[PDB]
Design a protein around this ligand. Structure first.
Ligand SMILES: Cc1ncc(COP(=O)(O)O)c(CNN[C@@](C)(Cc2ccc(O)c(O)c2)C(=O)O)c1O
Ligand SMILES: Cc1ncc(COP(=O)(O)O)c(CNN[C@@](C)(Cc2ccc(O)c(O)c2)C(=O)O)c1O
Lengths: 602, 602
């Protein structure tokens, strides 16, 4: 429809569109109450007119008012103001899409459970569409998807899929050896996922028994392999191994590079060596959007490697943790859902308003990674992150809908609970995601413009911080950024011009956070709020060494400190894409930081 | 505060309190927008006055209106009208508490994540209170609890707790044998949960290593035991075994009686025999509130047995699945949180308005079961069920807060995600439960009156159906109820006076449902809606035999049909507690059923 103002799809940092929200909220509530009054309209109201004027009613209503007044006080005292544009530079949390908030409230009035079509048939159809929409976002042909409570529970379901998938070859031999005839025990534990599926889908009257001898029985859980994850992974993955059964001991950290993306060379070493040891890879986890750095792993090279190892009879499952950057793929899809060629990206992004300045914003290495998500088997995608959908809304997407039969217990499912890890779920959550996917198409005409604004605002902050020098009473403090953002997270540190004590930078940056957080002061009066993370050698290795040395520290001071405290800003605000609007909040950030540093040292 | 009208704590079956809802909704939204405008009030609105009058804005707003209009159409076409009182007699779904709906919407405007205190400190304190409130509901002293996305995910976390708990004895010997010195391998796999906890809490500088050798490593998952569940259990438990690692093969169905409650004698047989086989019980699952019958298992006798077997060195973990009836315990607690003596129940329930007619409504056998929930280790409680809190809100409660350290990864937790199975969670979900727990105390002064009304309305329907005879063209059809409700679910069947074909009753009852559902007709025009369930011998055994024979069928016709189709009504409406209000909807149900049966046969 030509052009779409994102400035109307949010309530606003200063409640600029608060009447629009309130008016559409009331219009929707009024439509639900009309539905209610006109279901069995011959029935007269059970709550009488005199009951609603009684003292019993007034005392109950006044008590509700007192409880809601206490919720209001606590929420307006101890809550964080990330709705503001150029003052919040911290965690992956900004404003949520008004269409989604309006739709959750509307559907919550029906209280539908999506575990069963019978409970809410309309919210259930919406969830199936949302999964078919998640598949077409990931270019998965004949794929599927479902909303998960959170992204940690979706990462778990991924391991559930793979755990049960690698267990199927061995089980097939134990129930219908005919399917896996002439196959070495090790050729079974290195069978491609497509073949395992094609075989199972062939044995119609045997799928149940093959699955009864699968990992669902509890056997072969240590034999299916070792889960390979980036070392800078999320604890959801550690927890996933513990719960699924493989155990934390069958998790191997794959080292990351100085851009904090998995070292594909090192992955090759780990995989090839474990295969010489005849131990399989249950699977490798690729991360698009790192928890602390916004780093996009080279899914392109992870999948390229898989192909090269298949010639040597080694296959691994690939699950993409795109909890953060999954919605980010929309910046690469046209209105016909085709991946835009890179040579045309900058031109298409000017035609659609994704980016306001015609320059490179996305590296071909991140483009190539986002593209190869279609060759992976499963993806964790979190609407409650860069989908700007309200919590709790996570998501999983599978490359082949048939895969759901490896998790299946017993067309739109009539019992989604028999195709998912969780049980009872809100259909309001589905209406929230469907509304957002329908106001904002999962392409360059909708979510692309929103993610583009997040990225362009991250780049303006990056360029602002890379020239920031202060002056705190004969103490010049310079700001230094960690790496060029692969998405929209800009990490940064503060340093005294001539302090070669990393423990002193790690204390400067800890003190900047302390002031830029609830730790010190009232959060309703903080002029700049940011996030903090420690990069410790136990988990990050010497991946930050290049950075620490660039700032003038030694490899011994690094091993002495044991870590670097980095400040993190996931720029999810969609208001700082315009350099002009950023240049208003620029002096407001510098002035705030000066005072903050001036309180730290005096 | 004397007396509390529940008729003001709901929007209404005919939107009687829709202005109150809308007015408190707008008052709350207005309080949030004021908070937003007055955080950094020196900042001028980024969305300009002219932007909000532009055609770009109007076209975007009109598209949002069109999407929300499509959600409205689909939701008002294919949704179920359970808000009505005496016309919906089906699944555990009625109206949700207005205080909770108002509070979710208010807190959703802050979009707080409860996985971390830093994200929303106010919603996080509310969740800790809600868990301390769940513990005092279950009389757990020094206990704790947390909100789970759903009850299936809470049942999983229970198995996570027990799986890791039984694994601790063996692991203790492998890291600090000193703690479990002089203990047989089998005395370790039959150690009481308190001792395992007291031992682990003693080895301060070793807990991490003991846990690293626990089931979290992936070892000893088949050695920890067999999970014992009622045969009429929920598939969440089957799924839980598959995911946790023990596997579906280590799940033993314990047979139920003709009241569809676990046969404690049969449990004794299974437990004692498996102990002679030297195979441990990972744990036994007790169910308060059955999925299809509303049956309360004798936790009293399950725990009594545990004590008796401990003399023979056999201990089992007990997890209570009170997803449905957990909130039901409030009907037994005084304003000082003491369990009311049974001899006084009827008198206290008249003093508090829990029951309007002074008669027995709760059997001493259900009282005794609800009381012994305090001796169990963990309980699944679903606010999104009989807590009348909106979906998705489930819950877990642990008898000892220290138990969280067996699941712990790394005062109010500063990272609840390291004490729970899930990750990112809505703080709005917490504000919804906290609001309900604060308007309705978890005792006889709040939730007791609501659950009492649900139960008294279930009893009036039970007594109505037990004398219901029709007349469909020389075909007299009589209604027969399954069992006396243990909570608020009344199961029932329809039968032709002289049809001894159970397959014909199972078709009569299937046809009654077909008409009383979305299967046949428009659901906005259904005058009576009910639920259906098949009781098959594979899962229910000969537990329905007494019932089928009472209706005049033979033990051969039972084995021929293989099942009985039962109609189910979980009376969660709080409006039918008054016989006078029920007697209005009584003729409206009989008239509807007559027509329904008259369509089936002609
Ligand atoms: C890269 C990555 N993958 C998966 C997940 C798990 O997702 P989910 O939270 O839905 O279960 C994550 C985790 N992301 N969540 C955060 C960023 C949440 C958070 C927000 C604000 C805070 O103040 C804190 O402390 C946490 C997390 O780190 O857990 C992920 O990053
Ligand atoms: C006794 C019992 N225990 C645990 C659970 C799992 O709880 P959760 O749903 O929160 O994950 C259940 C399941 N209860 N859910 C229902 C009753 C849901 C449902 C409502 C309406 C419908 O039309 C259908 O089909 C299902 C279920 O049976 O799954 C439980 O009963």
């Amino acid at each position: 429809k030509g052009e779409m103002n994102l400035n109307a799809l949010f309530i606003g940092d200063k409640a600029e569109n608060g009447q629009l929200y309130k008016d559409l909220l009331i219009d929707l509530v009024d439509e639900h109450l009309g539905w209610r009054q006109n279901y069995m309209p011959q029935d007269m109201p059970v709550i009488s007119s005199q009951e609603r004027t009684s003292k019993s009613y007034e005392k109950t209503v006044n008590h509700m008012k007192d409880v809601l007044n206490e919720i209001s006080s606590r929420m307006r005292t101890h809550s964080v103001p990330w709705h503001t544009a150029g003052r919040y530079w911290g965690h992956m949390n900004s404003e949520t899409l008004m269409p989604s908030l309006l739709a959750y409230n509307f559907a919550m009035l029906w209280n539908g459970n999506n575990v069963a079509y019978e409970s809410s048939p309309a919210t259930s159809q919406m969830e199936e569409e949302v999964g078919h929409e998640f598949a077409h976002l990931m270019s998965y042909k004949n794929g599927w998807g479902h909303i998960v409570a959170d992204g940690s529970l979706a990462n778990l379901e991924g391991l559930w899929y793979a755990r049960n998938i690698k267990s199927l070859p061995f089980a097939m031999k134990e129930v219908k050896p005919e399917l896996v005839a002439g196959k070495s025990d090790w050729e079974l534990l290195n069978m491609p996922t497509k073949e395992i599926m094609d075989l199972l889908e062939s044995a119609e009257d045997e799928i149940d028994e093959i699955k009864a001898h699968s990992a669902r029985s509890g056997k072969h859980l240590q034999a299916i392999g070792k889960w390979l994850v980036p070392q800078t992974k999320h604890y959801s993955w550690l927890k996933a191994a513990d719960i699924i059964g493989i155990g934390l001991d069958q998790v191997i950290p794959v080292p990351v590079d100085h851009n904090y993306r998995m070292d594909i060379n090192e992955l090759e070493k780990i995989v090839r060596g474990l295969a010489e040891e005849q131990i399989p890879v249950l699977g490798v986890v690729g991360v698009v959007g790192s928890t602390e750095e916004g780093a996009v792993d080279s899914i392109d090279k992870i999948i390229a490697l898989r192909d090269e190892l298949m010639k040597d009879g080694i296959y691994y499952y690939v699950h993409v943790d795109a909890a953060y950057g999954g919605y980010g793929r929309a910046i690469f899809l046209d209105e016909d859902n085709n991946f835009i060629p890179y040579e045309d990206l900058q031109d298409v992004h000017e035609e659609y308003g994704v980016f306001k300045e015609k320059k490179e914003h996305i590296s071909r290495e991140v483009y190539d990674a986002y593209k190869a998500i279609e060759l992976a088997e499963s993806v964790t995608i979190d609407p409650h992150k860069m989908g700007y959908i309200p919590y709790s809304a996570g998501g999983i997407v599978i490359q082949d809908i048939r895969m759901r039969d490896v998790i299946s217990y017993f067309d739109i499912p009539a019992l989604l609970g028999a195709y998912i890890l969780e049980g009872s779920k809100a259909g309001a959550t589905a209406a929230s995601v469907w509304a957002a996917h329908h106001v904002l198409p999962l392409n360059v005409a909708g979510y692309g413009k929103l993610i583009g604004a997040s990225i362009e605002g991250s780049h303006h902050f990056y360029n602002f911080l890379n020239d920031l020098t202060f002056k705190v009473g004969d103490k010049e403090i310079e700001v230094h950024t960690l790496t060029h953002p692969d998405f929209n997270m800009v990490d940064y540190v503060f340093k005294e011009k001539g302090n070669d004590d990393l423990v002193a930078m790690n204390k400067l940056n800890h003190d900047v956070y302390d002031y830029a957080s609830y730790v010190k002061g009232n959060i309703y009066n903080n002029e700049f709020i940011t996030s903090h993370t420690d990069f410790a050698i136990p988990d990050y290795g010497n991946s930050p060494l290049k950075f620490v040395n660039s700032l003038g520290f030694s490899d011994e001071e690094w091993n002495r400190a044991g870590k670097v405290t980095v400040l993190r800003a996931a720029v999810m605000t969609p208001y700082m894409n315009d350099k002009e609007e950023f240049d208003v909040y620029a002096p407001k950030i510098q002035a705030a930081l000066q005072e903050k540093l001036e309180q730290i040292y005096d």
